[PDB]
């Protein structure tokens, strides 16, 4: 079993339910056994009242480790038109292109799955990484 799937460990969570395309939501593994585990989302809940954190059985292929801590130079390089990024939106990371860089530290970001175009502050974005074959790209 992969190191990062140990119960208790932080993860990010993909989905192929339509309307979660391009998202990675943060959570934790609850139960390892089939090719499937159960997680607990850190920011979603079963209920508006938010008393019961959401829990769900997924495939292990919908899971990936937390994104790597950006180095200090990486953590402060410039963001440019066309960079792929993840914006923090509906309490989740969503992937989009940067289409405009604005004079006040702000960016405008195009989402292809949802035809959406939304402004964000720099501290609401992260650099989009992919997690293939065990390594961060």
């Amino acid at each position: 079993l992969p190191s990062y799937l140990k119960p208790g460990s932080a993860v990010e969570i993909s989905s192929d339910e339509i309307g979660f395309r391009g998202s990675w939501y943060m959570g934790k593994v609850i139960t390892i056994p089939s090719v499937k585990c159960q997680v607990e989302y850190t920011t979603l809940f079963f209920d508006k009242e938010g008393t019961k954190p959401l829990k769900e059985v997924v495939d292990m292929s919908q899971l990936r480790p937390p994104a790597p801590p950006m180095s200090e130079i990486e953590k402060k390089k410039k963001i440019v038109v066309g960079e792929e990024v993840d914006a923090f939106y509906n309490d989740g990371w969503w992937e989009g292109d940067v289409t405009e860089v604005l004079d006040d530290g702000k960016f405008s970001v195009f989402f292809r799955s949802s035809k959406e175009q939304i402004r964000f502050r720099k501290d609401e974005l992260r650099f989009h990484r992919e997690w293939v074959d065990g390594a961060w790209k």
Binding site: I18, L44, F45, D47, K48, G50, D91, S113, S114, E116
Partner: peptide
Amino acid sequence: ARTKQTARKST
């Protein structure tokens, strides 16, 4: 307060 319902983008 955020649920799958108030987070999804479609259907």
